Design a protein around this ligand. Structure first.
Ligand SMILES: *[C@@H]1O[C@H](CO)[C@@H](O)[C@H](O)[C@H]1NC(C)=O
Ligand SMILES: [Ca+2]
Length: 372
């Protein structure tokens, strides 16, 4: 029973609690934090999305995600996870299918597709104790629009604006209407996006209502008018797929003509490792699934290109893109991978260290005084 916030395409949001709503601000904003009480200082983590305008109609798209876990700051930007400041909470950074996943010992998962979409998973412990654009995760939709000042509002725009992180950003006064703005895109938009209501997604229509996702798929196909509309369309179908695969109803919607994916590209010369899985596979073992964070909270189900490793080397080792035996993974220290044999660094005195040929990190003193 975790909660999931979604932020995708050109300004669409799904609170932990099931409220769909659009908001298009050109600022950084608080997707969710637990600094939500009366005290400035009382809380743990904030997750920020930096949004930018995308297209000419005035909509805005998510471009980066900032993660604060206590005094630690991470950014997801330019297809990377980069570290801005660190002193220590534990997090691990895996690539999973299409996505890039940051996972923390404290119940927090960020799932990012390296473009406009992010999912945020919180462990059930956080119920009630969060706030921001994702709501407060208390099973009640009616009340997610709580301003940073603890007032309830009906206005999408007041809500969103009160969760801006830099006060010099201007406020939003209007919610753009891209299809009326760009009627010459209405037809293509409604045709492509009509897959979401078609037979292909039949099984999911019991579990997830496709109206909001269809409407945002059209929104975006009209608003992506500067280049690259097929990525806005495909992103928008994929967000729906996800909710399905979550709520049980994995759909194989991709085809060579519609939103093709090129997993075969990653295959070496005479091999057939890499393959598209539309629902992941739950028993996917990587070197980082085994030696990093192990939360109750599942990410296996994401679509992407996955490798198939042999019996003789069942464990995919992300960092060197090779298959290996569990004991030849290497070492992880502060989410940094050292291979067997490599030397592991040490802000400690007279103490040298090594990652062994068995994926353990062990240290040795140096008597050059200092001893055992
Ligand atoms: C909470 O606010 C009080 C003042 O209301 C302040 O003394 C305190 O340092 C703040 N943070 C805490 C107690 O962690
Ligand atoms: Ca709520």
């Amino acid at each position: 029973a975790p909660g999931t916030c979604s932020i995708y395409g050109s300004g669409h949001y799904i609170t932990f609690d099931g409220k769909y709503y659009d908001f298009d601000g050109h600022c950084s904003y608080v997707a969710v934090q637990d600094y939500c009480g009366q005290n400035s200082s009382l809380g743990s983590f904030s997750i920020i999305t930096e949004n930018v305008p995308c297209g000419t109609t005035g909509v805005t798209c998510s471009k980066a995600i900032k993660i604060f876990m206590g005094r630690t700051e991470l950014k997801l930007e330019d297809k990377h996870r980069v570290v801005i400041q660190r002193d220590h909470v534990a997090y691990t950074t895996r690539e999973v299918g299409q996505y890039l996943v940051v996972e923390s010992s404290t119940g927090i998962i960020v799932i990012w597709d390296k473009r406009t979409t992010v999912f945020i998973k919180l462990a059930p412990s956080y119920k009630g104790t969060v706030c921001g654009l994702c709501g407060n995760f208390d099973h009640r939709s009616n009340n997610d629009f709580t301003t940073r000042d603890h007032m309830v509002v009906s206005s999408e725009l007041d809500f969103g604006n009160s969760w801006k992180e830099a006060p010099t950003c201007p406020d939003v006064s209007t919610n753009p209407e891209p299809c009326s703005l760009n009627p010459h895109r209405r037809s293509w938009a409604e045709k492509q996006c009509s897959i979401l209501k078609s037979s292909v997604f039949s099984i999911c229509h019991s579990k997830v209502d496709p109206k909001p996702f269809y409407e945002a798929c059209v929104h975006d196909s009209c608003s992506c008018d500067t280049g690259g509309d097929c990525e806005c369309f495909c992103s928008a179908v994929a967000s729906y797929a996800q909710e399905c695969t979550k709520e049980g109803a994995c759909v194989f919607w991709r085809t060579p003509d519609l939103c093709p994916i090129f997993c075969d590209y990653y295959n070496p010369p005479h091999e057939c490792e890499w393959h598209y899985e539309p629902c992941g596979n739950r028993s996917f073992e990587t070197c980082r699934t085994i030696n990093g964070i192990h939360s109750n909270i599942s990410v296996s189900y994401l679509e992407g290109c996955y490798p198939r490793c042999p019996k003789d080397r069942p464990i995919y080792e992300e960092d060197l893109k090779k298959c290996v035996t569990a004991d030849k993974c290497g070492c992880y220290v502060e989410d940094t991978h050292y291979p067997p044999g490599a030397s592991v660094p040490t802000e400690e005195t007279c103490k040298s260290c090594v990652c062994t040929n068995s994926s353990q990190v062990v240290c040795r003193p140096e008597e050059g005084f200092c001893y055992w």
